[PDB]
Every structure is written in C-alpha cells, then in structure tokens.
Amino acid sequence: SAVKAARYGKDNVRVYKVHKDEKTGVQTVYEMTVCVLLEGEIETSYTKADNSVIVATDSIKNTIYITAKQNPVTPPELFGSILGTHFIEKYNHIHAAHVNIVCHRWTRMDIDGKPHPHSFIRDSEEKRNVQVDVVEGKGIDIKSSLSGLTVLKSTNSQFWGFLRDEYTTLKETWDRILSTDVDATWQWKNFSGLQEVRSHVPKFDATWATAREVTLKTFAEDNSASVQATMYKMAEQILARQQLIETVEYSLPNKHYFEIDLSWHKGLQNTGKNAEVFAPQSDPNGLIKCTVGRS
Amino acid sequence: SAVKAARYGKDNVRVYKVHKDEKTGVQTVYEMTVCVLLEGEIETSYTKADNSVIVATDSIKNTIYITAKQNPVTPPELFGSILGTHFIEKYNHIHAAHVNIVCHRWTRMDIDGKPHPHSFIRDSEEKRNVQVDVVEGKGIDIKSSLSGLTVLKSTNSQFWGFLRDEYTTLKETWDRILSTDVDATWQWKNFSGLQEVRSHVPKFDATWATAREVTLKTFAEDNSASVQATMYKMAEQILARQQLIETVEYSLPNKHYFEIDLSWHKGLQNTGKNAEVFAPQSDPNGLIKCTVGRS
Amino acid sequence: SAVKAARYGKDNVRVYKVHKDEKTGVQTVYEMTVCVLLEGEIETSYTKADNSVIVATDSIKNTIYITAKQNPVTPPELFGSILGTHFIEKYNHIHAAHVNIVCHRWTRMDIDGKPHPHSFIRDSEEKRNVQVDVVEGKGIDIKSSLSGLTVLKSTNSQFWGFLRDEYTTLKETWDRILSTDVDATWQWKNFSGLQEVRSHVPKFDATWATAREVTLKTFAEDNSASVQATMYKMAEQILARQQLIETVEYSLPNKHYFEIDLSWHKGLQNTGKNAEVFAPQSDPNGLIKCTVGRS
Amino acid sequence: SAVKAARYGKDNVRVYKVHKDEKTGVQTVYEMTVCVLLEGEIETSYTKADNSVIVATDSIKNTIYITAKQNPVTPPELFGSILGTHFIEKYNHIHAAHVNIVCHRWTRMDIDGKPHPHSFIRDSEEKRNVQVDVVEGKGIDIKSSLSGLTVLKSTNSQFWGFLRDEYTTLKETWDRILSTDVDATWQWKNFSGLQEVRSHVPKFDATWATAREVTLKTFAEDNSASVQATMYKMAEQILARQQLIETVEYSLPNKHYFEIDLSWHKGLQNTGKNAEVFAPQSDPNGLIKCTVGRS
Ligand SMILES: O=c1[nH]c(=O)c2nn[nH]c2[nH]1
Ligand SMILES: O=c1[nH]c(=O)c2nn[nH]c2[nH]1
Ligand SMILES: O=c1[nH]c(=O)c2nn[nH]c2[nH]1
Ligand SMILES: O=c1[nH]c(=O)c2nn[nH]c2[nH]1
Ligand SMILES: [Ar]
Ligand SMILES: [Ar]
Ligand SMILES: [Ar]
Ligand SMILES: [Ar]
Ligand SMILES: [Ar]
Ligand SMILES: [Ar]
Ligand SMILES: [Ar]
Ligand SMILES: [Ar]
C-alpha cells in the first residue's frame, strides 16, 4: 500500500487577542478557534516512522500564538493567509497549509447608552469563519462564511405546487412559519500569494457585512415560495455586490414548526387562520443547499 | 420499603406562540421549553401498578399546549402559575405542580433602521427562566432567572491578597481578564395563589430588566477585587430595587484566560503590561456562588 | 443586605491516574472530573473585598492533583472523603467541602481473547458518580450514583388504566417499547468522618455493582406496568441488599418510540402486531422520579 | 447568476426497526439516523419558484420509513443503496441520491450469563456509518466507517526525532499516553447498481468487523513511533484483508494527557518514571489524517 493523501496539525487552538489604545483607553478584544493542517513530503512519517519530516503539532500550536502576537488577527482572511504562508515558506518540504478559523462574537457593551471601553457581550453563537488553503505554486484559496445565524419569520412563507404522488402527505400551505440556521459561504477568486490578499484587505469585512445584511433583508422581505427560491435571491445579490467572489453557497435547515390540532378538546380552533400555538420540531429537518455562480 | 418522595410528568415540551395584531399587521413570537412534574397521592402507581392515579405525561403535554392556547404565555411567571394552578385545582389527588420554563430569545429584526413586523433573530443563547412550584395549601413559590449571559472585560479585574500556603502557585495580579456565564436567580415572596401572582404581573418583566441592567452595568463598571466582591454588589442593588424579592443568587464560572510567556521565542514580550495574546482555558474553571438576602 | 449562603471552588478538574504493577507489567487507569466547593467564614470575601479568607480556586485545583498523587482515587467515595476532609482539617475557617466526582469508563481491552496489560476502551458514556459533603461537626454525607446507562426493551412494557378525561388522547397499550437513560442514586447512612468511610471501603464497589446488576436484570425481566412500577422494584431490591443505604432515588426519562401508521401508503400495515418501523422521539419525554426508603 | 450545484432533502430522520422471530421469541432492534439529499433537474425551484420539480422533503421522510418497512435496514450499505436507487428510478428528473446513515448501538443484554431475547444496552456512542451516493449512469459509490471509538493506552507510545527549530518547545519522549477517537473510513470499488451491491452483502458486516478488530489490535500492540506510523499499519492491514476496498482513511485526534510537575510541593515526584497523575487536555488536540491505497 501507499499514502494517497495526508495532512496533519493542531485543531481547536483557542486564541484571544486584546488591542489597547493607550491614548483613548479603548480596548478591543478578538477571540477565535484555529486549526492548522500541513501537507508536503511527509509520507515517510506514516510509512517508515520517519519523524524528521514532522513539524510537531505542539510547534504548530506555538506558531499560531507567535503569529497572533506579531500580526493583526483581523480580518481572519488575512490572519489565515499570514499563518498559512509562514508554514510553506519556513519549511522547504511543507507544500500546503490549510487554516480554518472560527471567530467568536465579543460585542462592545453599551452602558447607559455609551459604548464601554473594555466590556463585551457574546451576542449569539453566530460565527464568522474562514478556510484559507495556502498551496505552494498555486497561491491562496479563501472561503469566507457566516454560520449559526438563527432566524424565524411568523408569516410571508409559503410552500405549494410541489410534486404529489403516493409518497406525499404534506398539505400545500399559503402561510407558514420559516426558521433556519444560516450557513452562507463566499468563495474568493484565487489570490497569487499574501501580497495579493493584503491588497484586498478592506473587502473582507465589507463582503461579510454585505452577506449578513443581504441575508437578513431578503429573509425578512421575501414572500418566500420555498427555502430554495429565497436562498437563491440572497446568493445572486451577494455576487452582484462583490466582483472578487466567484461563488456563494447556502446550506439551510428548514426548522419545522407544526400546527397543533386542538379541535378534539372543547372544539378549540388552532389550525389555519386560527393557528397561534405550534410545536417546534427538533428533528427531522429539511436541508436545502445551493452553490450560485455567474452565468 | 416505602415511597419517601415521587414526582413525574413531561419534560422538554417545546412551545411556540404567535400574537398577530390585525390592525397594525405586527406579529410577536414567543418560544419556550416547558417541564411540568406533579406530586400528590400517586405512591400506588409505584408500589401496586395502580395507573388509575396517573394523569398521563402525554395528557400533561396536551394540557401545556391547551393552556398556551387559552392564556398569555408571558410573563413566564404568570403562565407557569396558571399551568401549575390548573393541575392542583383539576385533580383532587394532585397536591403540587412544579413548572420549569426556559424562554428562548426571538428579537424583532431591524431592516433599514425600521422594526420588521414578523421577522426575528435569536440574538443570544441567553435564557430567561422560571421555576414555579404550585403547592396546594402553601401557595406559589417562584424563582426567576437569567442564564447563559456570557460577558468578558479585558481589564479592571484584580485578584490579590488571597491565602498563600504550600498548596499555592497562583501569582497575585492587579490587571487580568474576567469572563463568566451569568446565572442570576431572584426568589419572590411566597404568593397565596394565582390571584396574588396576577396582582404583581408588571413586576416580573420589570425585575428581569433590572436584574439584567444591574448585572451588565456592575460587571462593566466595577474595578473587581474578585468574582465574590462583584457578584455581591449586583445582588445588593437588585434587592434594593424590588421589595417583593427575598433573595438574589448568583452562580458564576471564572472562565480563565491565561497569559502566554513567549520569551523563549526570540525574546518576544507577551506578559504583564506586554500581554496581548492569551490562551482561553476550557477547563477547569472557578465556580463562585452566593445567596444574598435582607439584613 | 447580607450573605445567606456562599460556596466557591474549582469545577471541571480533569484527572487521570495510572497504577503500574512492576512485577506483572499490568497497568490500570482511572479518569475522573472533579468539583470541590468550600463553605466557611468567607462572607467578607463577598462583602468587604477581603481576599485574605480565600483559598484560591487555583490552589484547590493543585490540592486535587496532589491528593490524587498521595492517595488511592478509588473507590470515588473514599477519594472524595479524603479530599473533603483535607480542606476542613487544613483551614480553620473552612467548615464544609462539597466534592463531586464523575468517573469515566476505561475498560481493559481483550485482544485475541486475552486482557491487554495497558490498552483500554471507553465502552460506554455511562458514569459512576459521587457527591461527598464533608461538614465540620456533622461528618460525611455520601450520595453514590450511576448515570447515562441507556437501555431499550422492544416488548414486555405496557401502559394502560391511567386517568382518562377531556385532556387525554393517549391510547392504552399492552405492548410498547421502553427506553430510558438510568440515573440511580443511593444515599449512605451519615459517616462520623474519614475513619468510618475507610471502615466501609469494600461496600462502595459492591453496592455500585449491585445497583447496576439490579437495574439491568429488573429492566430486562419486569413485564412493566409503568416506568413508576419498574423503577420501584429496582429501588426495593437495592435497599434489601445493602443495609448501610438509607434511600435509593431513580430519575428516568421515558424516551418515546412512536408507531408509524403507513396505511395511507398502499395499505401498508405497521401498527399493533404489525408495528416494525418506529419514530424515536427526541422530545418531549416523560420524566419519572422516585425516592424509596425503609418502612 | 446561475445554479452551479444544488442538493436538498431531509436530514436527522430517526428510524427504529424491530425483527421478531415468532418461533424463538428473540427480538433484534436496529436504530439509525438518516439523511437523504437529491440532485437533478431542480435548478428552477431556486431560480423561478418552480416547486413542480421538488419531491417534498416531507415525502423523502415518508419514503425513508416506507423503505425501512419494505426492506432489511442492515447492512446499512444495502439499505442506503436501496433507498438511493428508489429516488433515481422513481423520479425521471432526479439523477443522484446521497444517503448518509448513522447506526446507533443496541447490544443485547446478558442477564445471569444468558443473552436476553428483547433487552438492549447502548454500549458506547461509537457509530457505524455509511455514505451511499447513487448517481444515475455512474452506479453506487459507498464509503463505510466506524467513528467515536474512544481508546487509551497508558504506555508503549513514543514521540521523538521530530523537527526542532526556534518554534519547538515539545520534549522528546520514549514513554507517553496515547488516546484518540477513531474515525476510520473504507471506500468501496464503484458498484454498477443495486444488483452488484446485493451480490456483495456479506462483505459489508465482515469488513466493518475486520476494520474494528485491526484498529483495536494494532492500537493495543504497536509500540507506537507516532500517531502517523500506527494509523498507517491499521490502514495497510485492512486493505490486505478486503480486495473490494480501494482506500482506507483515518482521522485521529491526539487527545493529550500532560504530566504534572508537583516538585514545587514537598518535592513530590510525578514526572518521567514517577508520572502517575496527569491532566487530560480538552483542547487543543493534534489532528492526524491519512488516506492509504494500493501501491
Ligand atoms: O504522534 C504524534 N504526532 C505528531 O505529529 C505530533 N506532534 N506533536 N506531538 C505529536 N504526536
Ligand atoms: O410509564 C409511563 N408512565 C407515565 O406516567 C406515562 N404517561 N404517559 N405514558 C407513560 N408511561
Ligand atoms: O475572582 C476570583 N475568585 C477566587 O476565589 C479565585 N481563586 N483563584 N482565582 C480567583 N479569582
Ligand atoms: O421550502 C421548502 N422546500 C422543500 O423542498 C420542502 N419540502 N417540504 N417542505 C419544504 N419546504
Ligand atoms: Ar484572536
Ligand atoms: Ar431562506
Ligand atoms: Ar410560547
Ligand atoms: Ar462578576
Ligand atoms: Ar483519576
Ligand atoms: Ar424502568
Ligand atoms: Ar432502523
Ligand atoms: Ar493511533
């Protein structure tokens, strides 16, 4: 047998960084979880117990904290590119660095209507993520995402006109609840290297803001024919709003809220126009995926 | 052998309710998870396979949905009181109903600076909870809480002058990170029954808002001597601002953020006044608890 | 305002210990998660920023590791008793130590039908737990438990003859699935102190083994009238088999498996005697509790 | 813009099936979680609100329960192939069915040393999984796996000879703890369709048994030079033992157990040969991946 593929490194590296403006006393905090996996001429660590080719996962962990000390950790697209570039440049025999970052929310507190200089709240488990693949000779491939953005609308969702056969029980509806956990990913044009990533740094925060704003507005305002039709509208707007993105991907659960027929109890009316009380369904869930690109 | 205590019922009952204003078109959503456990003359269900005494957990589930249909689900102190009162009043042999409610956040979306009439975001995993114990002959005992309120301050936390002996390694500090998940409970004066709960309804939302505001402002503004000293100031203020509360209880983890000595690497300075990059510790954690009452 | 209750210490302390027999080469591993909370004359740490009274949670953490180094970590009732006794004996102003231990399974691997000397599998998420409350002047109160013991029987469960009224939809059944996660606790007679705990050491492993054996055999063999009736028979037998236990407590979810009527599809029969395919329900769940003591 | 890729369906479908031998009274239970995602000529559901092309996720859920009623649910490779084949054959415009199955453990109880006819224990959260991709014109691609197999050895693990530079702090060791959660995947030769999958049905259970046996024996017996070197030995043995597999993939966390220097406390010796008490590290973790094929 032979090694067809291999990658290794350190996962679940928790990092915090603080910025202190000594002039204003304003502090800004950043918290992330980092994974770095390396590829290269490392076959022999698997086949021949040749540890000489292994940059120790412990050393990869140290390198994450050192890089965080010596560079901005924002935007995560840039930090990931710096960290990935370090490994392929430092080590002749390392040819790819795969850097995943989950960014945790620390939103500045407003106390008596003024932003507090050094106190933060985790407003939601919503994440901002990157996958940065730094490949020697093939530049830097960046996927950006937001995930765990949990939303519900109580009307202006519909689902009718779907295929009906001997497997179908679902009633058509012209008025339902729609609730999802938004996972939205935008795939950047290939970058030639760290210089080109740096040249575009402001577009990262901007495009995340756009993706989040388009997601929330389209969800709120679309009189939805389906998850499919609504998610496509989000993707096409994001593409129209950032030329450097090639594709937008959505992965959306349909988190069902079922009507509860109470007519067995004192003729209580709680269906159709009378529906007030619903049973949120933990499982199963619809799962709807799309990747949208330019025509 | 004999039954010394027994309670039974339905846990993890997910409930959603919508209110629709037909004049303004504005919709408001409520989502909770409910547990109801019953006590009474039920020992024979355990000792003698006497199911005649069981109000089926399935029937308790139906009753939660029916009660939500026929009553306001807010504030949760009132809904719990109504639900618990139902069981002890309806069934001669049921003498206690223990109602736990977890309220899930659905915060109205602002789209283009305007509140949306029917679109919501889960803006934190923070919960608002009640435990309502309805006991025949002994009234209604309510504990109200907020939980999952995750906060961090980057400075204006200290920990020095603790006991130092042969078990002590911790360095004194005059400037550290403090981060916690706030679990805060306020225990109401005993209520005689549902009428007395109804007479205090506005105080529930008001006291929750006070508890949250005091928590956030005190956390942000206190130059903290310890978790102990800071949580005590929160509890004090809440007691001073609602005379119908007997006690305020805090349970606070100390979610440690450790400095990282990088001086082994090219003499990099990242401790004391140079500390920028920290290692968030998943475990272990300080756990600090208080119950504060009136002098 | 005044402190009515306070306790503080270190939670989520992960501990591993290995025993190595140098003669046989056989190694034995223990892994636990420990929480120690202290009470005593500590109110001034809350009211007056008086840290002089705090045994640092960091120091409690060190003490857990040192105690594990200097004593057996098994049975957990003994280790907890030793750990708790340390704090109240060492520190004049500490009057109570509350020790919780979760024991993680590391079961020796059988390789080619032979027990391996140093290789282990986590063969369930089932835990063995203790809560050891060491209170100066009032001895040592131990609750022992098994939890996370997940079981299912496919028949020989029934539920009929429960109360039927206008809230009732549940059909009587003489043949259903029963599945639960067993949480079983046995409360020991108060011990005068560490000497008395040491005098009963063999009874801890023996009573845990009895509790587990009775749970499994009674679950498997009882033609169950209800969760209530089955859990009571378990508690009875355990009380009858260890006179040093005062009470046995069960907390059992009813993890519902619902029949699926498929008769709408080509007249497929999948209910009653034809029931083969079921929908496991994540939520809600029955929750049935008992505490059984001696007549 | 345009749809580059799309797939949709139902996730987290919990299924239970029982087999009853009426002759012997022996019952056998199976429990799984199923996901089915469909591809085909469905672009217009996204682009034009054309729901005519949507087989409702609700209908996909019904189809899972009907297929489970009408077919064996074991081995999961076969059930997945039947379920996937159903969608591409039933619907002209559906061209691929992607079927993921997680199999949950229900191990028959031994009561007084005899296997019980209808009582089961969940021995471990270890899963057996399949990914079955049924693609019209391109046959059936099956990945089989075991996951969540949690193991530890207390010695006969080493890690020395790794690269040392200005980023390295890790001490070489000739005797450490090694603990992992095994995720092992074997990729089958492409099958032309359901007939060819059926022709190989016994190899599925056999190859799972082999994979699990090789994993446990190699882990227990290898005097490990690294995770890399040990996982490669497992993969090469599985390939040698089943000709119909093309690749074996392992993904292994290195779940670190750190020594605790206690020499600051009464010169306590707990390092190197004296190491008894360790701190299990929740995070970060080494992550080591390999895909092995034939040379
Ligand atoms: O088995 C190991 N492999 C590695 O790559 C590694 N790096 N640090 N420790 C390690 N252990
Ligand atoms: O065993 C049971 N106990 C109960 O109290 C119950 N209620 N519904 N189903 C039930 N099953
Ligand atoms: O605020 C704190 N309280 C404590 O009791 C403590 N112990 N270690 N660190 C601490 N921080
Ligand atoms: O938005 C929806 N899309 C679907 O594909 C679907 N299927 N059932 N319900 C549904 N809702
Ligand atoms: Ar960070
Ligand atoms: Ar959507
Ligand atoms: Ar609700
Ligand atoms: Ar605090
Ligand atoms: Ar241990
Ligand atoms: Ar039971
Ligand atoms: Ar199944
Ligand atoms: Ar391994």
Ligand code: NA
């Ligand atoms: Na390189």
Ligand code: NA
């Ligand atoms: Na009553």
Ligand code: NA
């Ligand atoms: Na004492």
Ligand code: NA
């Ligand atoms: Na087809």
